[PDB]
Design an enzyme around this catalytic site. Sequence first.
Site, PDB file in Angstrom:
ATOM      1  N   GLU A 109      37.921 -22.517 -72.239  1.00  0.00           N
ATOM      2  CA  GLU A 109      36.580 -23.840 -72.327  1.00  0.00           C
ATOM      3  C   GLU A 109      35.341 -23.700 -73.166  1.00  0.00           C
ATOM      4  OE1 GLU A 109      34.544 -24.783 -69.640  1.00  0.00           O
ATOM      5  OE2 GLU A 109      32.957 -26.514 -70.141  1.00  0.00           O
ATOM      6  N   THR A 147      29.583 -25.962 -56.225  1.00  0.00           N
ATOM      7  CA  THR A 147      30.140 -27.362 -55.872  1.00  0.00           C
ATOM      8  C   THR A 147      31.245 -27.527 -55.339  1.00  0.00           C
ATOM      9  OG1 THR A 147      30.326 -27.864 -58.528  1.00  0.00           O
ATOM     10  CG2 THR A 147      28.531 -28.870 -57.077  1.00  0.00           C
ATOM     11  N   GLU A 180      31.853   8.773 -63.767  1.00  0.00           N
ATOM     12  CA  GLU A 180      31.210   9.471 -62.738  1.00  0.00           C
ATOM     13  C   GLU A 180      31.345   8.237 -62.165  1.00  0.00           C
ATOM     14  OE1 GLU A 180      29.285  12.201 -64.673  1.00  0.00           O
ATOM     15  OE2 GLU A 180      27.512  12.558 -62.872  1.00  0.00           O
ATOM     16  N   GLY A 226      38.282 -20.788 -61.598  1.00  0.00           N
ATOM     17  CA  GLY A 226      39.436 -20.632 -61.902  1.00  0.00           C
ATOM     18  C   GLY A 226      39.682 -19.392 -63.838  1.00  0.00           C
ATOM     19  N   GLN A 273      32.754 -18.974 -67.050  1.00  0.00           N
ATOM     20  CA  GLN A 273      31.131 -19.373 -67.091  1.00  0.00           C
ATOM     21  C   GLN A 273      30.369 -17.690 -66.570  1.00  0.00           C
ATOM     22  OE1 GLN A 273      28.048 -22.860 -64.907  1.00  0.00           O
ATOM     23  NE2 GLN A 273      30.018 -23.884 -66.949  1.00  0.00           N
ATOM     24  N   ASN A 281      25.382 -14.869 -54.873  1.00  0.00           N
ATOM     25  CA  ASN A 281      24.679 -15.724 -55.232  1.00  0.00           C
ATOM     26  C   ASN A 281      23.928 -16.777 -54.121  1.00  0.00           C
ATOM     27  OD1 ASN A 281      25.581 -15.686 -58.159  1.00  0.00           O
ATOM     28  ND2 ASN A 281      26.204 -17.928 -57.712  1.00  0.00           N
TER      29      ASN A 281
HETATM   30  N1  LIG Z   1      24.959 -15.916 -61.092  1.00  0.00           N
HETATM   31  C1  LIG Z   1      25.871 -17.513 -61.944  1.00  0.00           C
HETATM   32  N2  LIG Z   1      26.524 -17.734 -61.151  1.00  0.00           N
HETATM   33  C2  LIG Z   1      27.264 -18.584 -61.414  1.00  0.00           C
HETATM   34  C3  LIG Z   1      27.307 -18.828 -63.476  1.00  0.00           C
HETATM   35  N3  LIG Z   1      27.952 -19.302 -63.441  1.00  0.00           N
HETATM   36  C4  LIG Z   1      28.093 -20.311 -62.542  1.00  0.00           C
HETATM   37  N4  LIG Z   1      28.437 -19.584 -61.220  1.00  0.00           N
HETATM   38  C5  LIG Z   1      28.957 -19.126 -60.008  1.00  0.00           C
HETATM   39  O1  LIG Z   1      30.762 -19.174 -60.097  1.00  0.00           O
HETATM   40  C6  LIG Z   1      31.280 -20.518 -59.665  1.00  0.00           C
HETATM   41  C7  LIG Z   1      31.853 -20.718 -60.273  1.00  0.00           C
HETATM   42  O2  LIG Z   1      33.261 -20.549 -61.091  1.00  0.00           O
HETATM   43  P1  LIG Z   1      32.524 -20.131 -63.146  1.00  0.00           P
HETATM   44  O3  LIG Z   1      32.395 -18.762 -63.644  1.00  0.00           O
HETATM   45  O4  LIG Z   1      31.700 -21.563 -63.307  1.00  0.00           O
HETATM   46  O5  LIG Z   1      34.513 -21.134 -62.969  1.00  0.00           O
HETATM   47  P2  LIG Z   1      34.757 -20.133 -64.917  1.00  0.00           P
HETATM   48  O6  LIG Z   1      35.523 -18.531 -64.209  1.00  0.00           O
HETATM   49  O7  LIG Z   1      34.357 -20.489 -65.388  1.00  0.00           O
HETATM   50  O8  LIG Z   1      36.814 -20.742 -63.983  1.00  0.00           O
HETATM   51  P3  LIG Z   1      36.856 -22.354 -64.883  1.00  0.00           P
HETATM   52  O9  LIG Z   1      37.154 -23.029 -63.095  1.00  0.00           O
HETATM   53  O10 LIG Z   1      37.296 -22.524 -66.315  1.00  0.00           O
HETATM   54  O11 LIG Z   1      35.632 -23.003 -65.173  1.00  0.00           O
HETATM   55  C8  LIG Z   1      30.331 -20.502 -58.831  1.00  0.00           C
HETATM   56  O12 LIG Z   1      30.243 -19.830 -57.358  1.00  0.00           O
HETATM   57  C9  LIG Z   1      29.138 -20.386 -59.434  1.00  0.00           C
HETATM   58  O13 LIG Z   1      28.009 -20.513 -58.324  1.00  0.00           O
HETATM   59  C10 LIG Z   1      25.755 -17.887 -63.457  1.00  0.00           C
HETATM   60  O14 LIG Z   1      25.759 -18.550 -65.102  1.00  0.00           O
HETATM   61  N5  LIG Z   1      25.502 -17.103 -62.939  1.00  0.00           N
HETATM   62 MG   LIG Z   2      34.367 -22.956 -66.423  1.00  0.00          MG
END
Ligand SMILES: Nc1nc2c(ncn2[C@@H]2O[C@H](COP(=O)(O)OP(=O)(O)OP(=O)(O)O)[C@@H](O)[C@H]2O)c(=O)[nH]1
Ligand SMILES: [Mg+2]
Lengths: 54, 425, 438, 352
Positions: free
Chosen positions: C71, C179, C254, C144, C11, C206
Amino acid sequence: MEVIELNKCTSGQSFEVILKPPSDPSLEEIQKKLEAAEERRKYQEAELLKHLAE
Amino acid sequence: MREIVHIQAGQCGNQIGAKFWEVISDEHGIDPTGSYHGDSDLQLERINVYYNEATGNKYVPRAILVDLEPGTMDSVRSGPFGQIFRPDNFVFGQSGAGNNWAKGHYTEGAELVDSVLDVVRKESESCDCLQGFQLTHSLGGGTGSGMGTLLISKIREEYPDRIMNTFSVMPSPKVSDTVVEPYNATLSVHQLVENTDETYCIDNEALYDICFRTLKLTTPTYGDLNHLVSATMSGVTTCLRFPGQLNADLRKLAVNMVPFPRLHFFMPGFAPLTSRQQYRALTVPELTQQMFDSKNMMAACDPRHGRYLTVAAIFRGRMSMKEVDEQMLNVQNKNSSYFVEWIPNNVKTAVCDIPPRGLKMSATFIGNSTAIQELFKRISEQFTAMFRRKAFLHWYTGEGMDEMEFTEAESNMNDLVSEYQQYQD
Amino acid sequence: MRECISIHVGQAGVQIGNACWELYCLEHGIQPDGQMPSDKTIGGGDDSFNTFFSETGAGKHVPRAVFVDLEPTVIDEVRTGTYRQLFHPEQLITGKEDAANNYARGHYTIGKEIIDLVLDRIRKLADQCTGLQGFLVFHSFGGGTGSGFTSLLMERLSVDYGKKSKLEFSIYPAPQVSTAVVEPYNSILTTHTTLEHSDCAFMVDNEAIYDICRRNLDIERPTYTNLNRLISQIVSSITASLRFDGALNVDLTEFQTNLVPYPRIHFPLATYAPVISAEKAYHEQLSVAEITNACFEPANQMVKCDPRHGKYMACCLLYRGDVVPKDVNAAIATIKTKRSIQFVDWCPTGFKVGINYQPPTVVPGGDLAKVQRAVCMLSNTTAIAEAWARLDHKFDLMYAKRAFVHWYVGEGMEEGEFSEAREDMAALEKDYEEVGVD
Amino acid sequence: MYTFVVRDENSSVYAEVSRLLLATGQWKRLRKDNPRFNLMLGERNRLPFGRLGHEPGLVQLVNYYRGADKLCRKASLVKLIKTSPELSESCTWFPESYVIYPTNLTDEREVFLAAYNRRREGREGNVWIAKSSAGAGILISSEASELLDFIDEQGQVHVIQKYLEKPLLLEPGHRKFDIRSWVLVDHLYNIYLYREGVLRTSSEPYNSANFQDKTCHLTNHCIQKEYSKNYGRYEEGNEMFFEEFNQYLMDALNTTLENSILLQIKHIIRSCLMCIEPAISTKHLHYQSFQLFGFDFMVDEELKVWLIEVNGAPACAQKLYAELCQGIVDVAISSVFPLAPTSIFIKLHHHH
Ligand SMILES: Nc1nc2c(ncn2[C@@H]2O[C@H](COP(=O)(O)OP(=O)(O)OP(=O)(O)O)[C@@H](O)[C@H]2O)c(=O)[nH]1
Ligand SMILES: [Mg+2]
Ligand SMILES: Nc1ncnc2c1ncn2[C@@H]1O[C@H](COP(=O)(O)OP(=O)(O)CP(=O)(O)O)[C@@H](O)[C@H]1O
Ligand SMILES: Nc1nc2c(ncn2[C@@H]2O[C@H](COP(=O)(O)OP(=O)(O)O)[C@@H](O)[C@H]2O)c(=O)[nH]1
Ligand SMILES: CS(=O)(=O)NCCc1ccc(F)cc1
Ligand SMILES: [Ca+2]
Ligand SMILES: [Ca+2]
Ligand SMILES: [Ca+2]
Ligand SMILES: [Mg+2]
Ligand SMILES: [Mg+2]
């Protein structure tokens, strides 16, 4: 405080300033790790079914 | 398309499950006939989580009604939203379970379970990607307790890597139907320890005290108790039924709420709980103070007697998400002695925009607290007070059970109590 | 001209990728339909922006990017969003159920089943390149997929593209916008298995982006959209040299040569300024010295730490807008006599400066205000080891009780991988202390 | 309800501060490993500053300035004075010092002998003192051969500085002494000097023809109470407070404590702390710091004040614990976490 390698172009320029001088796992090995974990999952699940069969 | 298959078994299971579909059907704009009539697209974004879509834009709950006697499900089929359930999804017998775990699990229940799994398999085969299952039932009776845990055992065998979730009503002598309820609860609890990923413990005594002392209901009924369960079940599932930056499916929740496989029994909570001064606007501080107040919790366990492993709070309604964080960050930083210090940031908060019907804002509480050991201690004590004299055992040995199985349920429960105790220090 | 392939995993990676390409298009004059009126060579060319965009015969400029998520809900936004026309379906890869914040689930259980498909799609973009430089990999530490699948992808990229450079943009976990409780596990597991496969990694905490959005942009409760548009400005400042004419950081190689003398210590600190709220009546425009001085304030660092108590190994100043070398050196002199900048004795005390005359582009309706000049400092300080210390400590608290460990073992991971990964981090922290402390 | 943790059980100062915080009913103490704290009374060594200021919604405050060791280490202080332009090498209130590493390990051995031979050839008093931070281990001598050989027998860095051969001696007694000033620096980097100081006096007559017996040369409270035979004779616990010392300066020298000594002390404190402000300030930091310092001064027979050292974890005089500790709560703790005079400190204004 020296400027070296000054490069200029139409979209910008870049240079360097020096204030002071100084003083893998093969494809085969990755498949084994992946399949080893897949095997440990199959084992744990079989022990679940064995437990449920009892 | 992360579908959840809902199952409700026995009298309590079907009465509580009925109101649950009544409550959330109202939230998603689904009328008793299955037709949608809401005014917000949020109501449909995740509608397929609990409802199937049929011809003519009809939404049918993905629910399976199970019982060993017809009576309760005839009431549902004639109840408010009775017509909304798939007719084929009613599976029931005629013998009854006589409040007997052995009859639900080994004799009467066994004869009916295969046909229940035929319906479950039917609903699963049509899911694009099945999240998992959720079961509602009591542990004090025979069908929901005995056959319910039999269903879970056979669902885990056929779906070993799907999440199994339950809402489990725990018996209490203060709100009792029969004296064998400790027997049935002790036997079921072990099945849940083994075969559920998350179990929301609902204690009928907590529901009673809330209707009596807080809600000021002179003479509570099962209906009154079931109103609290409906509201609470709607609150805990808000994460799953509406969109939000949290996402969260059943497995993701379980991964963040269950630090140890056997300690997966949660204490739910709801706020507000007002008596009929009911129109007064509730501020964020009051929602937070009540949500963590023991009198708002439904496990009948004083949280100040144990420690929270993980805590999830869901706020509903248009409110100050900045002020929500402030009050939440205030309760933690004001009582950090009841939170284990070896799980960093074990208190999470989520906000939903759509509030429950008839409330400007609400808060649902989900705690994985080691205080829950008090509930299991009560059940164990009542079990042993009768089992030491073998009282009422003949109802169970007459169904083919042996005394050894009771001795093993006792040890299994006392082990569980011992496991909670070690994490409380 | 050498091409760069961008990979977005999970995500955080996909949503940050969506924000960057949105910005890249506005910077290069590319429209949502892929057309670029200023590109006088139709369906071809080896210009600097071609490192990130290919071209079809019809004149469509297509990102050299792959989006991967277990997903589909996040990548579906790309399929139907404003820039849906840019990408073609082969570029967007989605599964049906995610890793549930479980590194083992993304690396082993689910990763094993999708890894070969992802390599196939990347191979398709590689076959369009006449001289591939390497990969830019965006992902989160906590997710994950971002943690577990990224490490697997990096292992296979090292096998299938041995001589190619790999840079990361990694999101460091912050409780204010998360969360999940197990993210310390995932972060350490993915850093361990990825460390020897990444040549240079830009960590973004973050927590830092969150406070910048509240302090500078006056956002009481920032969203991911707010966080991501700010991050995509930093990313753009870092990749601008690859996409525009210039002489500094002209290829991924570089980046390692200028920022990473020691391989394991490859996590430069990023500092950006100025960040001005768009809602302001009208801001006083900052000078070259003021924005350069701001590069040594902890408040605008992508990771909160105190560089005054570390040692610098390298230092790049990347300017965008109205900036001439005369003013840069004038501000650097002033800062040295006022700041606490200690370089390691085995490195020259100097700064590499790059200037791009085009000021930062701002997304219409965004939060950032248009400024006349901005700078992004890339400095390799031992002080960034504070980020590892914080993370390793949280890992220790939970692992001492084996909390949540059963979820990982259940997906086929051995418990020894936890300690094997933690010991690697203990060695990484020791490396930073040997370089920085006396 | 504010929260705090305690990570240094051996601190008499913050044992009282913690005892006062609880007495207010508005401060709650947590286990030393609980991250959800407002205030940390941290450990002396290896305090984990990197873990501070990362708890959402918690303003976190600590009783130590990261980087202040540069001022509270024997060798560090010498290097800071000689290398900092604000203090310069010609600093007029710090005894000529040299950093000397033992030969079994930059080093200023040759620079020391150069200034040593210059004094020996010029008939000038050439008595130096060698000391380190790993001592309770001090040597005073007029021969460079003995000073250097004593350091090679050890294994830690030492400092050799000029020994004040003309110290100011109290009467009656003809006895040496030093002055301890407590200074509190709050999160805003205000410099508050406690109005109460203590003279740790020697109960033995100062003898310049015998540096072997170090009882009359070292004014440490522990040395006088163990190896001195006149302990507590002239003042209780070899401690004279400013009220008495000021009255003495008026009777004997016809001057005041403020005019003759305190102006130099306040000047030295300012110069030392202002120098390192850009290195340790927490003005724009994600957490906040304060710290109590113990400055030790020497006074010669010309009424010139010399800086001896700066203690980062100082103790207080028994009589002054109640007043000073309360003052730490007022200007350092409640200024950041307010509760629901005639200040005891002297603010030393300066340009930040
Ligand atoms: N800066 C920023 N952080 C994000 C974003 N989306 C999720 N996060 C951070 O990423 C962490 C959660 O990991 P995700 O990237 O959402 O999970 P994933 O890589 O999709 O893996 P899954 O468990 O399969 O959902 C948390 O610490 C969130 O704060 C985003 O769009 N921008
Ligand atoms: Mg995800
Ligand atoms: N250059 C010098 N000239 C004269 N006396 C000196 C001196 N250096 C040290 N002393 C004497 O040594 C005593 C204390 O030495 P020092 O302060 O270095 O040890 P220490 O640090 O263990 C005590 P504290 O830390 O409490 O001040 C003082 O009383 C002072 O009289
Ligand atoms: N909260 C609630 N509890 C119930 C209800 N009906 C029964 N119970 C409880 O459930 C237990 C009896 O189980 P029951 O569901 O009637 O048995 P079953 O039909 O064989 O599954 C007792 O502890 C009752 O107090 C109900 O409608 N609401
Ligand atoms: C055999 S009994 O003791 O009479 N049964 C009481 C059940 C009940 C008690 C309180 C309620 F609020 C609802 C139901
Ligand atoms: Ca039969
Ligand atoms: Ca072209
Ligand atoms: Ca490699
Ligand atoms: Mg019944
Ligand atoms: Mg000392």
